[PDB]
Amino acid sequence: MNINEILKKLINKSDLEINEAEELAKAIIRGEVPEILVSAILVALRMKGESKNEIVGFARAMRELAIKIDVPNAIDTAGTGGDGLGTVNVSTASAILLSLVNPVAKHGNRAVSGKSGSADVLEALGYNIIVPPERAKELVNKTNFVFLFAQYYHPAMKNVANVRKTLGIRTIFNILGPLTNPANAKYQLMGVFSKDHLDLLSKSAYELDFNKIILVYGEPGIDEVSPIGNTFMKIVSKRGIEEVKLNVTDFGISPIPIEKLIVNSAEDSAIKIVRAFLGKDEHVAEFIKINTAVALFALDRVGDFREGYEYADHLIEKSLDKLNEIISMNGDVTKLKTIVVKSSG
Amino acid sequence: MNINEILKKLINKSDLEINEAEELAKAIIRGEVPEILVSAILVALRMKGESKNEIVGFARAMRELAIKIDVPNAIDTAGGLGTVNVSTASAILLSLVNPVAKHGNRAVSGKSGSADVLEALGYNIIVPPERAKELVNKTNFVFLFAQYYHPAMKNVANVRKTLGIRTIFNILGPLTNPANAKYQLMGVFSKDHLDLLSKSAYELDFNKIILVYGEPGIDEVSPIGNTFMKIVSKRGIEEVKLNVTDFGISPIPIEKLIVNSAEDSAIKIVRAFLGKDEHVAEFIKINTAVALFALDRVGDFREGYEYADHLIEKSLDKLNEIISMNGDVTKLKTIVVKS
């Protein structure tokens, strides 16, 4: 493991071996590499185009250094994110419904793009986003939900923060987020921002020891189930990767108006999610439904995508109360109540 | 000028416009860009593959920020198989019939650098810019130690050393002569550079600059076989191929041109001047021949070769006048001693 040799290899557009990539990431995350070289390597990786072995190597390096809690039966709804449309944080809302039927270990962070990270939307809801591992295990047991803040559960990652921020461009670390859940959740709905990443990440995921992880790419170009058109999907399990194409209509809905699903801040996301839970926003509620339906299919709790949607319908009607119990046990309900009062409670 | 927007553009493999690259280069050289971002930018440029505009832009940036003197009428020559540095010797011959503003640095590669050879010869390679033009006026020759005439490059040194790889800055040296010499003979290390650097040179305002790539891989005129060349002027770019045999000579065995020390390179050049090393003398003449064509002092390479033979017979004395005015002639006399 010699950083200069690795950089030369990358400059020459040669893919790294898994062990090679793992060792590289470890050194980087542990802060053993000069910032100048970390920057060069991240830029080189992206321009070469990261490979399956590199994603796998980096993913394992992060997991190895992460703080862990035990909940493999949990499901997560993390997505890679991406520089595109600023849609309402549906993965946070979907996570609330899911907690009604399965333990949820939500892995998230804050965002640079204004305030669009799941951590930001939950904080706006009144959730206390910093949960020490002992209490985290407690919360999931009592409410089937817990938020695992990346900046807290991946402490070594602060060693790459300055470079990542200064760079100001997406790198390999941005697509590894959902692959490094601190609770080691074996079930997951992972959103991706492109058709190629769909292929790259599913093959990477196949070697990452999941029970069932479904990756999706929403059509306009979203890392969520498409509200307007088709959703390209890949269902990976211990037996392979299933290709699945899908349209919003296969849920039983009519194309959802993108304008009604757009937000410009964490609180607007919070307000919209609550409005849907209150039955005041049919479109946002439908967006939550389709995303949750696929998540249920991942849990094998529904044999069909429309059955998932239908079941997700029962769930949303009991979601605000669930959100209320979640926040009260780990957060400030006063805030939640003002947000409720914000979109007419 | 937005650095982040520039980076995103390179990351997407889109070439920059000339003005864009020039402002980017200026900011970097001025040290106004965080090292993390300078590193990112150099790597992105390298992997995308630098374009003509990016070369032009960066070269104009270094020119603007360099310590300058003005001898546009002067000519500069080319410059690691370890072959003797004939571009330095050639610079000496040329100074007999035209002002020479030799731009160079020390080599990393064990003293093959023009600055190393000049030093071993007795020349004081560190020339203050004020004294620079006076030396050219009085002796028709002056060496411009790059490292000192491009002081602002200190602002990219740490990134360059830490990266350890070749970047856009490694091919700009000959396009940044501090004396603004309009005539130049510059070697490239690959045929792909011939095409790109010539198109870049075409827009760098030279009267006449000839780019050469010599077999088996040298940034000079080939002494063993072919030399792929491009002649750039206000009138366009001409493709020209040439074989050492055209100069009317037999291919020189490269083994007889390889040196492994600055002093050894100095000794071989002097022996050539003294008529004691015909193979080296030949290597010097064929290079001097193309430069002579660049100045339009001859109308053909053979003529340039024949002309160069007259010049070499007078180069030891010329070297002595040059050094006596800037350097130590006792060291030159030490080197002369048969050797």
XYZ file of C-alpha atoms in Angstrom:
684
model
C 0.000 0.000 0.000
C 1.954 2.972 -1.335
C -0.166 6.063 -2.043
C 2.064 7.295 -4.876
C 1.875 3.902 -6.634
C -1.912 3.921 -6.242
C -2.213 7.444 -7.682
C -0.079 6.484 -10.687
C -2.263 3.432 -11.277
C -5.417 5.552 -11.114
C -3.971 8.252 -13.377
C -3.373 5.397 -15.824
C -7.034 4.467 -15.465
C -6.310 1.044 -13.987
C -8.931 -0.309 -11.583
C -7.793 -1.231 -8.092
C -8.105 -4.693 -6.545
C -10.479 -4.998 -3.561
C -7.740 -5.413 -0.920
C -5.879 -2.605 -2.613
C -8.972 -0.366 -2.441
C -9.735 -1.371 1.173
C -6.240 -0.496 2.347
C -6.385 2.772 0.418
C -9.688 3.809 2.006
C -8.494 2.792 5.494
C -5.413 4.999 5.216
C -7.526 7.849 3.896
C -10.238 7.556 6.536
C -7.680 7.167 9.334
C -6.108 10.424 8.155
C -2.764 8.910 7.216
C -2.710 10.508 3.752
C -1.708 14.131 2.944
C -4.800 16.162 1.952
C -3.156 16.901 -1.377
C -3.033 13.193 -2.220
C -6.521 12.437 -0.877
C -7.855 15.112 -3.227
C -5.900 13.720 -6.175
C -7.058 10.148 -5.520
C -10.752 11.086 -5.172
C -10.615 13.144 -8.387
C -8.718 10.372 -10.185
C -11.229 7.714 -9.045
C -14.184 9.726 -10.270
C -12.667 10.540 -13.655
C -11.508 6.982 -14.211
C -14.979 5.871 -13.146
C -15.125 3.885 -9.917
C -15.337 0.108 -10.222
C -17.236 -2.558 -8.321
C -14.097 -3.666 -6.488
C -13.347 -0.091 -5.437
C -16.872 0.555 -4.091
C -16.692 -2.770 -2.252
C -13.249 -2.049 -0.838
C -14.154 1.437 0.352
C -17.470 0.222 1.784
C -15.766 -2.448 3.838
C -13.127 -0.011 5.095
C -15.830 2.368 6.377
C -17.883 -0.396 7.997
C -14.771 -1.726 9.726
C -14.130 1.694 11.315
C -17.763 2.505 12.103
C -19.417 2.468 15.515
C -21.896 -0.415 15.392
C -25.183 -1.472 16.983
C -26.827 -4.832 16.314
C -30.085 -4.813 14.326
C -29.670 -6.862 11.086
C -33.449 -7.324 10.884
C -33.883 -3.576 10.425
C -34.563 -1.915 7.087
C -33.105 1.411 5.870
C -34.204 3.770 3.085
C -30.942 5.649 2.410
C -30.261 6.925 -1.091
C -27.047 8.219 -2.688
C -28.438 11.685 -3.319
C -27.200 13.719 -6.270
C -27.063 17.143 -7.905
C -30.575 17.239 -9.319
C -34.153 18.162 -8.438
C -34.771 19.262 -4.847
C -37.567 16.819 -4.004
C -39.274 16.376 -0.612
C -37.349 13.966 1.652
C -39.575 10.968 0.958
C -37.083 8.460 2.407
C -37.611 10.009 5.844
C -41.411 9.852 5.530
C -41.267 6.330 4.112
C -39.077 5.331 7.057
C -41.848 6.442 9.413
C -44.458 4.211 7.747
C -42.034 1.269 7.715
C -41.451 1.548 11.466
C -45.132 0.619 11.756
C -44.312 -2.848 10.403
C -40.558 -3.380 10.890
C -37.662 -2.024 12.934
C -36.074 0.836 11.032
C -32.412 1.836 11.330
C -32.319 5.087 9.344
C -28.771 6.077 8.323
C -28.472 9.731 7.342
C -26.674 13.066 7.378
C -27.090 16.834 7.028
C -26.779 18.412 3.588
C -24.792 21.222 1.969
C -27.560 21.923 -0.543
C -29.468 24.233 1.783
C -30.892 21.772 4.291
C -31.931 18.644 2.425
C -30.394 15.830 4.443
C -32.643 13.417 6.345
C -30.875 14.555 9.532
C -32.022 18.113 8.784
C -35.655 17.207 8.153
C -35.829 15.085 11.345
C -34.239 17.848 13.403
C -36.877 20.220 11.988
C -39.465 17.696 13.137
C -38.018 17.889 16.628
C -36.019 14.641 16.523
C -32.802 14.522 18.547
C -30.397 13.340 15.820
C -27.483 12.441 18.114
C -28.229 9.050 19.613
C -25.502 7.187 21.536
C -25.484 3.435 20.661
C -26.862 2.265 24.003
C -29.938 4.481 23.674
C -30.267 3.737 19.955
C -30.823 0.036 20.702
C -33.361 1.151 23.308
C -35.335 3.368 20.903
C -35.621 0.764 18.159
C -36.916 -1.767 20.680
C -39.598 0.610 21.952
C -40.576 2.352 18.704
C -39.042 0.279 15.900
C -37.233 3.438 14.739
C -33.882 5.113 15.307
C -31.837 7.621 13.322
C -28.128 6.820 13.005
C -26.340 10.134 12.296
C -23.356 9.471 9.984
C -21.221 12.241 11.495
C -21.680 10.481 14.832
C -21.585 6.803 13.846
C -18.628 7.233 11.452
C -16.260 9.329 13.598
C -13.151 8.581 11.519
C -14.834 10.224 8.521
C -14.092 13.684 9.925
C -10.542 12.984 8.672
C -11.799 13.452 5.099
C -14.282 16.273 5.790
C -12.016 19.194 4.953
C -10.998 17.725 1.595
C -14.539 16.671 0.747
C -15.881 20.137 1.560
C -13.067 22.056 -0.102
C -13.405 19.915 -3.228
C -17.108 20.706 -3.430
C -17.809 17.887 -5.884
C -19.343 14.445 -5.426
C -16.862 11.596 -4.977
C -16.865 7.883 -4.194
C -17.817 8.642 -0.580
C -21.142 10.157 -1.705
C -22.440 6.843 -3.100
C -21.154 4.734 -0.215
C -23.503 6.289 2.346
C -26.381 3.781 2.041
C -23.910 0.893 1.905
C -22.523 1.627 5.348
C -25.527 1.441 7.698
C -24.163 1.317 11.318
C -26.807 -1.214 12.420
C -25.800 -3.548 9.588
C -29.384 -3.640 8.309
C -29.829 -6.494 5.845
C -32.888 -4.953 4.209
C -32.770 -1.735 2.233
C -34.259 0.450 -0.468
C -31.316 2.370 -1.933
C -31.888 5.245 -4.327
C -29.380 6.013 -7.065
C -28.968 8.956 -9.458
C -28.200 7.201 -12.763
C -28.657 4.062 -14.828
C -24.956 3.284 -14.704
C -24.750 3.647 -10.953
C -27.704 1.241 -10.867
C -25.539 -1.436 -12.458
C -22.338 -0.533 -10.618
C -23.946 -0.328 -7.214
C -26.071 -3.457 -7.538
C -23.030 -5.574 -8.430
C -21.174 -3.907 -5.553
C -24.133 -4.533 -3.243
C -24.256 -8.192 -4.266
C -20.888 -8.689 -2.556
C -21.779 -6.587 0.489
C -23.722 -9.237 2.442
C -27.317 -7.959 2.333
C -30.403 -10.168 2.648
C -32.406 -7.984 0.279
C -31.470 -4.574 -1.090
C -33.406 -2.970 -3.919
C -31.741 -0.109 -5.760
C -33.817 2.404 -7.710
C -33.425 5.288 -10.142
C -36.460 7.493 -10.523
C -37.371 8.954 -13.874
C -36.740 12.674 -14.322
C -33.428 11.695 -12.716
C -34.130 10.975 -9.026
C -32.746 8.515 -6.464
C -36.321 7.731 -5.409
C -39.251 5.865 -6.990
C -40.407 7.924 -9.981
C -43.611 9.967 -9.392
C -44.014 10.894 -13.067
C -42.733 7.983 -15.140
C -40.688 4.809 -14.926
C -38.476 3.510 -12.156
C -35.523 1.333 -13.109
C -34.868 -1.232 -10.417
C -32.434 -3.945 -9.325
C -33.325 -6.455 -6.628
C -30.193 -8.041 -5.219
C -30.221 -10.975 -2.832
C -27.944 -13.839 -1.871
C -29.054 -15.495 -5.110
C -28.503 -12.756 -7.671
C -29.651 -9.471 -9.163
C -33.161 -9.190 -10.608
C -33.792 -6.479 -13.213
C -37.138 -4.714 -12.814
C -38.690 -1.870 -14.800
C -41.706 -0.032 -13.424
C -44.053 2.881 -14.098
C -45.928 5.093 -11.629
C -49.174 3.720 -13.054
C -48.337 0.167 -11.958
C -49.155 1.397 -8.461
C -52.690 2.430 -9.358
C -51.987 6.165 -9.556
C -51.855 8.805 -12.263
C -48.597 10.701 -12.911
C -47.840 12.893 -9.893
C -47.114 16.612 -10.557
C -43.428 17.256 -9.844
C -44.101 20.866 -8.787
C -46.153 19.610 -5.841
C -43.262 17.384 -4.775
C -40.561 20.067 -4.722
C -39.101 21.771 -1.647
C -36.564 24.502 -0.839
C -35.666 23.742 2.788
C -35.668 21.127 5.534
C -38.706 22.643 7.238
C -40.679 22.696 3.990
C -39.971 18.994 3.694
C -41.087 18.541 7.312
C -44.246 20.574 6.747
C -45.093 18.689 3.549
C -44.503 15.269 5.082
C -46.833 16.192 7.942
C -49.429 17.651 5.566
C -49.539 14.302 3.772
C -49.857 12.459 7.085
C -52.691 14.855 7.981
C -54.375 13.997 4.694
C -53.925 17.571 3.486
C -51.532 16.802 0.633
C -52.703 14.049 -1.695
C -49.708 14.359 -4.032
C -46.979 14.246 -1.404
C -48.869 11.391 0.250
C -48.952 9.462 -3.026
C -45.209 10.051 -3.461
C -44.649 8.577 0.008
C -46.909 5.630 -0.862
C -45.093 4.409 -3.975
C -41.666 4.654 -2.338
C -42.937 2.764 0.733
C -44.568 0.110 -1.454
C -41.214 -0.887 -2.931
C -39.688 -0.887 0.565
C -42.377 -3.351 1.684
C -41.667 -5.553 -1.329
C -38.040 -5.594 -0.152
C -39.226 -6.931 3.210
C -41.101 -9.617 1.273
C -44.199 -8.521 3.196
C -46.188 -7.944 0.023
C -46.147 -10.094 -3.100
C -46.998 -7.238 -5.441
C -46.185 -3.549 -5.976
C -49.836 -2.461 -5.826
C -50.450 -4.530 -2.705
C -47.529 -2.624 -1.228
C -49.152 0.668 -2.184
C -52.489 -0.445 -0.751
C -50.864 -1.623 2.471
C -48.868 1.607 2.610
C -52.280 3.298 2.651
C -53.253 1.797 6.014
C -49.852 2.795 7.336
C -49.925 6.493 6.464
C -53.217 6.932 8.326
C -51.379 5.925 11.498
C -48.113 7.694 10.684
C -48.534 11.076 12.381
C -49.264 9.344 15.683
C -46.203 7.136 15.139
C -44.138 10.233 14.369
C -45.504 11.765 17.551
C -44.465 8.778 19.681
C -41.034 8.705 17.984
C -40.286 12.342 18.623
C -41.591 12.365 22.195
C -39.251 9.525 23.243
C -36.227 11.128 21.557
C -36.838 14.774 20.792
C -38.994 17.853 21.321
C -42.725 17.438 20.632
C -43.308 21.176 20.962
C -41.425 21.661 17.699
C -43.356 18.851 16.031
C -46.600 20.460 17.185
C -45.672 23.850 15.746
C -44.951 22.161 12.415
C -48.342 20.462 12.676
C -49.820 23.898 13.336
C -47.857 25.001 10.287
C -49.595 23.207 7.804
C -52.901 23.762 9.573
C -52.914 20.896 12.013
C -13.243 33.484 -11.695
C -14.976 30.512 -10.032
C -12.683 27.614 -9.132
C -15.470 25.174 -8.304
C -17.210 25.739 -11.628
C -13.881 25.240 -13.394
C -13.272 21.944 -11.595
C -16.739 20.578 -12.342
C -16.106 21.346 -16.016
C -12.802 19.406 -16.069
C -14.370 16.563 -14.090
C -16.831 16.323 -16.974
C -13.974 16.280 -19.474
C -14.903 19.590 -21.136
C -12.002 21.735 -22.403
C -11.633 25.243 -21.021
C -11.591 28.370 -23.173
C -8.268 30.207 -23.422
C -9.253 33.061 -21.121
C -10.693 30.584 -18.605
C -7.507 28.544 -18.438
C -5.438 31.726 -18.263
C -7.332 33.126 -15.275
C -7.290 29.707 -13.617
C -3.528 29.449 -14.109
C -2.991 33.015 -12.853
C -4.928 32.395 -9.651
C -3.052 29.144 -9.051
C 0.373 30.638 -9.676
C -0.499 33.646 -7.543
C -1.250 31.158 -4.771
C -4.885 32.224 -4.371
C -6.158 28.640 -4.723
C -6.261 26.105 -1.845
C -3.725 23.285 -2.325
C -6.562 20.730 -2.206
C -8.150 22.459 -5.212
C -4.858 23.007 -7.083
C -4.197 19.266 -6.744
C -7.711 18.435 -7.980
C -7.346 20.747 -10.960
C -3.971 19.391 -12.074
C -5.182 15.803 -11.815
C -8.428 16.575 -13.692
C -6.475 18.332 -16.475
C -4.050 15.384 -16.709
C -6.780 12.728 -16.888
C -9.016 14.621 -19.275
C -5.905 15.304 -21.328
C -4.906 18.955 -21.683
C -6.169 20.815 -24.736
C -4.593 23.456 -26.950
C -6.473 26.297 -25.244
C -5.470 25.123 -21.781
C -1.822 25.063 -22.887
C -2.092 28.540 -24.416
C -3.883 29.889 -21.367
C -1.367 28.529 -18.851
C 1.630 29.665 -20.895
C 0.281 33.211 -21.117
C -0.265 33.145 -17.354
C 3.334 32.146 -16.573
C 4.675 34.674 -19.074
C 2.738 37.466 -17.389
C 3.913 36.490 -13.899
C 7.533 35.781 -14.855
C 10.521 38.065 -14.320
C 11.121 39.393 -17.822
C 13.794 41.059 -19.930
C 13.297 41.921 -23.595
C 15.286 40.267 -26.365
C 12.567 39.159 -28.851
C 15.244 38.956 -31.572
C 16.979 36.126 -29.690
C 16.695 32.372 -30.195
C 16.398 29.584 -27.594
C 17.098 25.856 -28.106
C 15.665 22.469 -27.080
C 16.892 20.335 -24.191
C 15.966 10.841 -20.102
C 18.251 8.533 -22.049
C 21.105 10.593 -20.631
C 22.472 11.982 -23.905
C 24.884 14.916 -23.707
C 23.002 18.254 -23.600
C 23.670 19.441 -27.149
C 21.057 22.196 -26.958
C 23.418 24.006 -24.593
C 26.405 23.525 -26.899
C 24.209 24.468 -29.852
C 23.224 27.644 -27.953
C 26.939 28.499 -27.863
C 27.454 28.111 -31.638
C 24.381 30.198 -32.412
C 25.595 33.049 -30.208
C 28.250 33.630 -32.892
C 25.608 34.885 -35.329
C 22.565 35.876 -33.273
C 21.544 36.729 -29.712
C 20.845 33.666 -27.576
C 18.534 33.651 -24.538
C 18.879 30.093 -23.189
C 16.027 29.201 -20.818
C 16.671 26.203 -18.570
C 16.837 24.456 -15.196
C 18.987 21.889 -13.439
C 17.958 18.347 -14.198
C 16.529 16.085 -11.527
C 18.008 13.311 -13.651
C 21.666 13.344 -12.582
C 23.105 16.528 -14.089
C 22.080 16.523 -17.723
C 20.379 19.853 -17.189
C 21.576 22.848 -19.161
C 22.176 24.630 -15.852
C 24.337 21.768 -14.595
C 26.437 21.675 -17.763
C 26.893 25.467 -17.834
C 27.937 25.404 -14.191
C 30.543 22.677 -14.762
C 31.831 24.806 -17.656
C 32.395 27.771 -15.329
C 29.340 29.900 -16.168
C 27.533 31.564 -13.234
C 24.026 30.218 -13.917
C 22.242 32.574 -11.515
C 22.001 35.813 -13.475
C 20.144 38.812 -11.986
C 17.647 40.135 -14.557
C 19.342 43.565 -14.711
C 22.654 41.987 -15.616
C 20.858 39.664 -18.040
C 20.265 42.068 -20.910
C 23.712 43.577 -20.546
C 25.342 40.159 -20.969
C 23.332 39.501 -24.160
C 24.226 42.933 -25.486
C 27.932 42.404 -24.796
C 28.363 38.683 -25.534
C 25.227 37.700 -27.481
C 24.351 34.990 -24.937
C 22.685 34.655 -21.548
C 21.310 31.749 -19.562
C 17.986 32.292 -17.799
C 17.725 29.846 -14.871
C 13.962 29.083 -14.964
C 13.610 28.414 -11.258
C 14.692 32.026 -10.586
C 12.947 33.747 -13.485
C 9.617 32.137 -12.543
C 9.636 32.767 -8.750
C 5.843 32.632 -8.469
C 6.021 28.901 -9.248
C 6.985 28.522 -5.586
C 3.218 28.749 -4.941
C 2.626 25.410 -6.670
C 5.807 23.632 -5.531
C 4.274 21.747 -2.599
C 1.379 20.429 -4.697
C 3.757 19.466 -7.482
C 6.204 17.579 -5.266
C 3.507 15.825 -3.227
C 1.615 14.749 -6.362
C 4.889 13.456 -7.770
C 3.362 13.013 -11.235
C 3.701 14.972 -14.470
C 1.182 17.812 -14.877
C 0.440 20.554 -17.376
C 3.356 22.522 -15.886
C 5.928 19.954 -17.082
C 5.488 20.781 -20.778
C 5.258 24.585 -20.638
C 8.922 25.349 -20.004
C 9.915 26.051 -23.610
C 6.814 28.160 -24.248
C 7.792 30.469 -21.400
C 11.210 31.915 -22.273
C 11.693 34.938 -19.899
C 13.385 36.979 -22.650
C 10.404 36.654 -24.984
C 12.668 35.182 -27.685
C 10.700 34.974 -30.958
C 12.832 32.212 -32.484
C 12.890 28.826 -30.807
C 13.770 25.159 -31.293
C 11.847 23.053 -28.775
C 11.829 19.317 -28.279
C 8.854 17.286 -27.089
C 8.892 13.815 -25.536
C 6.172 12.252 -27.688
C 4.580 12.487 -31.127
C 1.239 13.345 -29.521
C 2.843 16.406 -27.971
C 4.177 17.471 -31.364
C 0.665 17.988 -32.679
C -0.778 19.680 -29.586
C 2.207 21.809 -28.592
C 2.653 23.036 -32.175
C -1.001 24.110 -32.344
C -0.495 25.779 -28.964
C 2.714 27.436 -30.170
C 0.919 28.663 -33.272
C -1.096 30.925 -30.986
C 1.754 31.945 -28.694
C 3.066 34.690 -31.000
C 6.454 33.367 -32.174
C 8.129 34.574 -35.367
C 9.323 31.019 -35.944
C 9.369 27.986 -33.669
C 10.268 24.487 -34.777
C 9.133 21.568 -32.631
C 11.048 18.321 -32.782
C 10.743 14.750 -31.594
C 13.758 12.559 -32.291
C 14.095 8.778 -32.228
C 14.394 6.715 -30.118
C 12.673 9.207 -27.845
C 14.513 12.479 -27.351
C 13.406 16.117 -27.246
C 15.956 17.057 -29.916
C 17.037 16.326 -33.493
C 17.649 12.583 -33.921
C 21.276 11.427 -34.285
C 20.299 7.791 -35.018
C 17.293 8.000 -37.319
C 14.163 10.075 -37.878
C 13.120 13.368 -36.351
C 9.463 14.297 -36.600
C 9.195 18.035 -36.943
C 6.703 20.888 -37.148
C 7.550 24.409 -38.300
C 5.301 27.072 -36.795
C 5.087 30.670 -38.018
C 2.478 33.358 -38.694
C 1.841 31.403 -41.898
C 0.735 28.162 -40.276
C 2.186 24.808 -39.284
C 4.299 22.701 -41.646
C 4.841 18.981 -41.187
C 8.411 17.912 -41.884
C 10.190 14.576 -41.561
C 13.966 14.236 -41.499
C 16.616 11.525 -41.175
C 20.097 12.072 -39.757
C 21.386 10.789 -43.105
C 19.829 13.820 -44.801
C 22.447 15.924 -42.991
C 24.775 13.804 -45.089
C 26.134 11.709 -42.213
C 26.086 8.157 -40.858
C 23.792 7.417 -37.877
C 25.724 8.011 -34.640
C 25.677 5.165 -32.117
C 23.702 6.542 -29.174
C 26.190 4.927 -26.762
C 28.758 7.508 -27.836
C 26.401 10.340 -26.851
C 25.400 9.210 -23.348
C 27.044 10.835 -20.323
C 26.534 10.269 -16.609
C 27.640 13.500 -14.909
C 27.590 17.251 -15.512
C 31.354 17.411 -15.713
C 31.362 14.553 -18.233
C 28.819 16.372 -20.363
C 31.007 19.496 -20.147
C 34.100 17.530 -21.157
C 32.363 15.950 -24.154
C 31.106 19.307 -25.408
C 34.575 20.852 -25.166
C 36.179 17.836 -26.827
C 33.656 18.300 -29.626
C 34.652 21.984 -29.888
C 38.321 20.900 -29.869
C 37.738 18.454 -32.716
C 38.398 15.521 -30.364
C 34.897 13.964 -30.369
C 33.421 13.907 -33.850
C 30.209 12.041 -32.881
C 29.246 14.661 -30.298
C 30.275 17.452 -32.680
C 27.949 15.865 -35.243
C 25.045 15.711 -32.753
C 25.640 19.390 -32.005
C 25.719 20.382 -35.691
C 22.512 18.667 -36.787
C 20.668 20.413 -33.956
C 22.367 23.710 -34.711
C 21.386 23.143 -38.352
C 17.643 23.126 -37.640
C 17.936 26.166 -35.355
C 19.852 27.969 -38.114
C 16.913 27.185 -40.394
C 14.537 28.657 -37.799
C 16.439 31.955 -37.950
C 16.226 31.703 -41.735
C 20.023 32.042 -42.016
C 20.108 29.068 -44.376
C 17.549 27.800 -46.838
C 18.099 24.114 -46.190
C 19.174 21.669 -43.429
C 22.317 20.569 -45.261
C 23.415 24.196 -45.631
C 22.680 24.644 -41.938
C 24.863 21.611 -41.263
C 27.739 22.978 -43.341
C 27.305 26.398 -41.726
C 27.347 24.793 -38.279
C 30.752 23.263 -38.984
C 32.230 26.750 -39.396
C 30.571 27.910 -36.181
C 31.840 24.975 -34.065
C 35.466 25.789 -34.959
C 34.939 29.107 -33.174
C 32.830 28.000 -30.212
C 35.515 27.259 -27.628
C 36.808 30.831 -27.929
C 33.237 32.155 -27.882
C 32.490 30.080 -24.770
C 35.540 31.609 -23.161
C 34.428 35.193 -23.890
C 30.948 34.402 -22.529
C 32.187 32.819 -19.299
C 34.893 35.420 -18.676
C 32.153 38.037 -18.477
C 29.960 35.893 -16.215
C 31.684 33.013 -14.479
C 35.119 31.537 -13.839
C 37.378 30.900 -16.839
C 39.888 28.975 -14.736
C 37.231 26.253 -14.393
C 36.808 26.285 -18.166
C 40.553 25.936 -18.577
C 40.480 23.025 -16.135
C 37.819 21.342 -18.269
C 39.764 22.127 -21.457
C 42.714 20.223 -20.308
C 42.664 17.741 -23.479
C 39.501 16.903 -22.056
